[PDB]
Design an enzyme around this catalytic site. Structure first.
Site, PDB file in Angstrom:
ATOM      1  N   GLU A 197     -15.764   0.463   1.955  1.00  0.00           N
ATOM      2  CA  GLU A 197     -16.514   1.318   2.880  1.00  0.00           C
ATOM      3  C   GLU A 197     -16.179   2.804   2.772  1.00  0.00           C
ATOM      4  OE1 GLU A 197     -17.382  -2.227   6.202  1.00  0.00           O
ATOM      5  OE2 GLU A 197     -17.393  -0.161   6.964  1.00  0.00           O
ATOM      6  N   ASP A 206     -25.445  10.679   9.754  1.00  0.00           N
ATOM      7  CA  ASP A 206     -26.352  10.205   8.721  1.00  0.00           C
ATOM      8  C   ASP A 206     -27.828  10.655   8.880  1.00  0.00           C
ATOM      9  OD1 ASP A 206     -27.747   8.142  10.102  1.00  0.00           O
ATOM     10  OD2 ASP A 206     -26.491   6.526   9.282  1.00  0.00           O
TER      11      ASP A 206
END
Ligand code: OLC
Ligand code: 5EH
Length: 428
Positions: A197, A206
């Site tokens: 990750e 994001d």
């Protein structure tokens, strides 16, 4: 009386087991390794021990006096001292290689090659064959053996004890403690999910406006960056400013892991698989939960059953057919490999050195386990004048002869290429 053939059967295996190693190197192209030439020299020294030192020592137990005479008896005095020195020298010369092999992978300068390996395996036998000199040197009788010509000299007996054993064993250990310091991680779950990750130390927003920090810790219900900053500040327990440290990221990670295991156990399809699974295999399952969720993972009905049922290859083939595998292939492969093997292999580098280091350690662990007791018994006789019987003294010399029988057995346990070549030759 019953120990006449007991020591003889031990000798009988050593003449073949060491001979098997010697045949296996010349026969297989896959076993023509430069680092395997040091395993050859050790099997040579250990064969001389089986065919010459071992049968001649059985005679002394059957017939108190030697049927040998000056030529056979002086050579047996040499072959016992030369081969045993060659054994410590093969080990010390092997450890020096693995060390430089670990340090400089690019030794394309003619160092990891026959011209440098055979030069150090020939020169090692020069320092070992020097034993034949003090065997004939009286210029400077008892009931233990052929008599070493200097058995009464306790100042020379202690100087050869260090020079040929105490000095190499300490330098050998010093170098190995350095080899073991070069390939020593062996992962964990935080390191595993860091690989998969990634570790963010500053809040990332994001494309759909989601705030991530650490090992993908989402900051739930954070409309703005200031909301995400305020939630993070509550979690960490300080004024972070969107910037955390590795140790904070690990604290937060550790929370998410407990949160994931709690959730796994609250799951009907999950709880039985997790429970059946070992330490590493649980990590591979937690890892999936971290990417797809309790619900997503629990919709892996067939594979989860193969895992529960301990069918690791069946599961590794099945999981490789999943849509998950088609979408994230590199993570799925690392996770699937972890379920297959039950090791951290997928998350580790230098696995060939790592493997070879365990083998070297096993070899060194045998040679100190077999010879120490005898050398510490030499530390006893030196000032005592015979503090104990020759009933146990006969065993400490045979325990050292046990290493000669034990080393050919070590190679397949640690080395893969040896394990198959030894199996294929037995079933012809
Ligand atoms: C309100 C106070 C705002 C946060 C005060 C802490 C500043 C800090 O530690 O920020 C480092 C910076 O983000 C590195 O780029
Ligand atoms: C009787 N034999 C089994 C003992 C000789 C083997 C030795 C040894 C013992 C005392 C002094 C020197 C030496 C030669 O070097 C060795 C190195 C490693 C293991 C045993 C010996």
């Amino acid at each position: 009386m019953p120990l006449v053939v007991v020591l003889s059967t031990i000798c009988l295996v050593t003449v073949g087991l060491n001979l098997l190693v010697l045949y296996a190197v010349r026969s297989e192209r896959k076993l023509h390794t430069v680092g395997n030439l040091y395993i050859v020299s050790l099997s040579v020294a250990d064969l001389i021990v089986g065919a010459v030192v071992m049968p001649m020592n059985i005679l002394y137990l059957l017939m108190s006096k030697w049927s040998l005479g000056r030529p056979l008896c002086l050579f047996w005095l040499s072959m016992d001292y030369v081969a045993s020195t060659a054994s410590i020298f093969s080990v010390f010369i092997l450890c020096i290689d693995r060390y430089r092999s670990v340090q400089q992978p690019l030794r394309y300068l003619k160092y990891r090659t026959k011209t440098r390996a055979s030069a150090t395996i020939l020169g090692a036998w020069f320092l070992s064959f020097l034993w034949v000199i003090p065997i004939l040197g009286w210029n400077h009788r008892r009931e233990d053996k052929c008599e070493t010509d200097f058995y009464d000299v306790t100042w020379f007996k202690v100087m050869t004890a260090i020079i040929n054993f105490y000095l190499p064993t300490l330098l050998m250990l010093w170098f190995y403690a350095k080899i073991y310091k070069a390939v020593r991680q062996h992962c964990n779950i935080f390191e595993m999910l860091r690989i998969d990750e990634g570790l963010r130390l500053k809040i990332y927003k994001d494309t759909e406006g989601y705030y991530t920090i650490g090992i993908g810790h989402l900051l739930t219900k954070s409309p703005s960056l200031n909301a995400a900053k305020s939630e993070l500040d509550k979690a960490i327990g300080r004024n972070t400013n969107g910037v955390i440290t590795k140790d904070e990221a690990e604290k937060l990670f550790n929370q998410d892991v407990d949160a994931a295991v709690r959730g796994i156990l609250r799951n009907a399809k999950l709880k039985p698989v997790y429970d059946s699974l070992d330490a590493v295999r649980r990590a591979a399952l937690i890892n999936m939960v971290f990417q797809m969720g309790e619900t997503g993972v629990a919709g892996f009905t067939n594979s989860l059953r193969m895992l529960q049922q301990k069918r690791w290859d069946e599961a590794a083939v099945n999981l490789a057919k999943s849509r998950w595998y088609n979408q994230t292939p590199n993570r799925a492969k690392r996770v699937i490999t972890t379920f297959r093997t039950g090791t951290w292999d997928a998350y580790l580098h230098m696995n060939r050195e790592r493997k070879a280091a365990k083998q070297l350690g096993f070899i060194m662990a045998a040679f100190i386990l077999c010879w120490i007791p005898y050398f510490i018994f030499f530390m006893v006789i030196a000032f005592c004048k015979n503090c104990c019987n020759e009933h146990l003294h006969m065993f400490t010399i045979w325990l050292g002869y046990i290493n000669s029988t034990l080393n050919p057995l070590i190679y397949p346990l640690c080395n893969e290429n040896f394990k198959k070549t030894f199996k294929r030759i037995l079933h012809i």
